[PDB]
Design a protein around this ligand. Structure first.
Ligand SMILES: CCCCCCCCCCCCCC(=O)O[C@H](COC(=O)CCCCCCCCCC)COP(=O)(O)OCC[N+](C)(C)C
Lengths: 52, 108
């Protein structure tokens, strides 16, 4: 129950955001790419011949 | 004519069986895979009924397809195909003989 031009106001939030977690996004993408290449390395070098 | 081809084929086949001890094992499996299909159709002809028709068709498909994969193994196992060894025809027989049992257990 609040109206247009008589209850506009602001809202205030205070928070913290360290320099540690600022750089975790490209390291998260980079860790998924790095754990994606090793599957191609193990899958590629592995013996599957049935003859000698 | 047919007497000469008959006795020629009997002798030239029985010597081939007595040479290799793999072939009589295949053919001994094959003949009783024919008798399964014969009496399994004799149940249908005996009492005139056709109600669980998929359960009829699944066992008959098992008999025919399982017969055919044995004949392909026999043809490929006497004379080798150019490029395919004898260790690879057998593994292909295992895999393609192992798909068919699953799709004939879903179907009943
Ligand atoms: C529908 C498809 C599903 C298939 C699942 C298996 C996937 C295997 C993929 C193989 C990749 C190709 C590499 C390969 O060639 O291996 C095959 C491999 O030969 C085979 O096919 C044997 C595989 C099955 C192994 C047997 C265990 C039973 C498997 C569980 C049902 C063997 O052939 P080769 O040994 O390479 O042939 C002779 C060697 N040359 C140098 C001449 C080529």
């Amino acid at each position: 129950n609040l109206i247009s031009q008589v209850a506009n106001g602001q809202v205030l939030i205070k928070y913290d955001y360290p320099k540690s977690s600022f750089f975790k996004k490209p390291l998260s993408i980079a860790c998924y790419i790095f754990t994606a290449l090793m599957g191609v390395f193990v899958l590629k070098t592995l013996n599957m011949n049935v003859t000698n | 004519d047919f007497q000469e081809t008959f006795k020629t084929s009997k002798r030239a086949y029985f010597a081939q069986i007595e040479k290799y001890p793999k072939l009589k094992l295949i053919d001994t499996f094959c003949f009783f895979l024919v008798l399964l299909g014969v009496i399994q159709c004799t149940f249908i002809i005996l009492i005139r009924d056709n109600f669980p028709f998929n359960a009829f068709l699944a066992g008959f498909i098992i008999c025919v397809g399982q017969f055919v994969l044995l004949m392909s193994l026999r043809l490929q196992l006497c004379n080798s195909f150019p490029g395919i060894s004898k260790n690879r025809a057998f593994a292909e027989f295992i895999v393609a003989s192992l798909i068919l049992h699953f799709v004939c257990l879903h179907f009943i």
